[PDB]
Amino acid sequence: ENQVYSPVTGARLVAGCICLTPDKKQVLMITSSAHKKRWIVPAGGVEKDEPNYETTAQRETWEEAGCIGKIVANLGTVEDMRPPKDWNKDIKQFENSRKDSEVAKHPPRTEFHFYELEIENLLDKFPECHKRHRKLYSYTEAKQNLIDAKRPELLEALNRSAIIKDD
Ligand SMILES: [Cl-]
Ligand SMILES: [Mg+2]
């Protein structure tokens, strides 16, 4: 009940961090709680008492990854546009035009506010350290992880960061 939603779309409001090594060659990824083999980035729900998205982003990066660092860029917003739960059993799932197909119009599940963080430390004891793994990946590896995880919005956020892409 401490969760915050868009007053317009009803999307859950979430913040998180693209956590880069100081040399900008790697990004910190974490395993999903539900799916141990899916690698994503730290992010979670804004809570009602939190004054800004940076606070949520750095809290969730601590809770989920045991990562501390400095926010160095605002990477703006991305949206989880996965269709609702009922979607694949509904009668009209797609809206087609002359040269294009789209999933039927729906609000986003989640609106993510992403920041780029420069990693200053990784701690062995952190709140979710027995529920998740946290590991550095090159850009090429991280991109494949996020496609494997079916989270293109997280890849959109990563691509806005200063991560070195030509591995
Ligand atoms: Cl909003
Ligand atoms: Mg979360």
Numbering used by the authors: 21 to 187
Wording from the paper:
ScDDP1, like its human orthologs, adopts the canonical Nudix fold showing two β sheets flanked by helices. The active site lies in the crevice situated between both β sheets. The longest helix (α-1) contains the Nudix box (GX5EX7REUXEEXGU), which displays a β-loop-helix-loop structure that binds the Mg2+ ions involved in diphosphate moiety orientation and catalysis.
Therefore, it seems that removing the positive charges relieves the tension in this highly electropositive active site, especially those for Lys63, the mutation of which apparently increased the thermal stability by almost 12°C. As mentioned, Lys63 is not conserved in HsDIPPs; however, it is conserved in MsMutT1 enzyme.
